[PDB]
Design an enzyme around this catalytic site. Structure first.
Site, mmCIF file in Angstrom:
data_model
loop_
_atom_site.group_PDB
_atom_site.id
_atom_site.type_symbol
_atom_site.label_atom_id
_atom_site.label_comp_id
_atom_site.label_asym_id
_atom_site.label_seq_id
_atom_site.Cartn_x
_atom_site.Cartn_y
_atom_site.Cartn_z
ATOM 1 N N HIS A 178 48.912 20.392 96.784
ATOM 2 C CA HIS A 178 47.633 19.699 96.874
ATOM 3 C C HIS A 178 46.824 19.950 95.611
ATOM 4 C CE1 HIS A 178 46.110 23.650 98.737
ATOM 5 N NE2 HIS A 178 45.367 23.482 97.657
ATOM 6 N N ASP A 187 53.911 21.950 100.748
ATOM 7 C CA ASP A 187 52.801 22.180 99.836
ATOM 8 C C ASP A 187 53.104 23.202 98.748
ATOM 9 O OD1 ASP A 187 49.191 22.857 100.161
ATOM 10 O OD2 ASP A 187 50.394 21.893 98.607
ATOM 11 N N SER A 208 43.606 29.484 96.192
ATOM 12 C CA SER A 208 44.683 28.642 96.707
ATOM 13 C C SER A 208 45.622 28.493 95.506
ATOM 14 C CB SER A 208 44.105 27.269 97.089
ATOM 15 O OG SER A 208 44.655 26.751 98.295
#
Length: 226
Positions: free
Chosen positions: A72, A102, A181
């Protein structure tokens, strides 16, 4: 001085944790993420939104300049910028990835010398209650760190999206968010046990952080082998 393991790991793995900025002109713009940086990182230039499409973290897993992160984050990207702790900037080449898991690998040109890198641990051997250190680097010039413990493995969370599920995730009470992240989730041994992933927003919720087990990442990497 030397009685602080966590401090030691970071000191050891920080120089391998990178930043990942992608200019606009536009899909990986999930409104949750832009709001996190916008609201919490006053270090963001006046022209963030208009100019940026995605800001995240990642990490070099092999000297040749190979990097892992969240899909992402980089996603289907044309303009990918990688910034390092020493200050140096680079251009990464989207090697490959997977949106349903992901995971996403990137590559930076190593003109002369090779880069510093992290080593993979083993997800199958992770014990619940062991310390996990999440490392991030969205600003580039400094690494952010949060500590917790492994809470649970193999988790399945319905995407509040109402269109899928996040699955096979490692859970931690270590804070995980758009600010780390893509960075790595380490052991007390400096081994990467997962890739911090914030897709799980988590949306005004607490201490519920998740990561992608490296063993899963390894099975992915192997599908993009040279």
């Amino acid at each position: 001085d030397y009685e602080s393991p966590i401090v030691n790991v970071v000191e050891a793995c920080a120089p391998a944790v990178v930043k990942i900025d992608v200019v606009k002109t536009t899909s990986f713009f999930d409104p949750y993420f832009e709001q996190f940086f916008k609201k919490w990182f006053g270090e963001l230039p006046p022209g963030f939104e208009r100019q940026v499409a995605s800001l995240g973290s990642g990490f070099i897993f092999d000297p040749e300049g190979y990097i892992l992160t969240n899909y992402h984050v980089v996603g289907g990207a044309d303009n990918i910028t990688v910034t390092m702790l020493d200050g140096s900037k680079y251009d990464a080449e989207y090697i490959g990835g997977d949106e349903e898991l992901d995971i996403a690998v990137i590559k930076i040109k190593a003109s002369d010398k090779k880069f510093p890198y992290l080593e993979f641990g083993d997800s199958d051997k992770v014990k619940i209650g062991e310390w996990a250190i999440a490392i991030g680097n969205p600003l580039g010039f400094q690494h952010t760190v949060t500590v917790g413990v492994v809470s649970a493995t193999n988790r399945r969370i319905p995407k509040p999206d109402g269109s899928g599920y996040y699955v096979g995730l490692i859970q931690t009470d270590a804070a995980i968010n758009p600010g780390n992240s893509g960075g790595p989730l380490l052991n007390i041994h400096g081994e990467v046990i997962g890739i911090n992933t914030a897709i799980v927003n988590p949306q005004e919720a607490v201490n519920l952080g998740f990561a992608i087990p490296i063993n899963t990442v390894k099975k992915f990497l192997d599908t993009i082998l040279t």
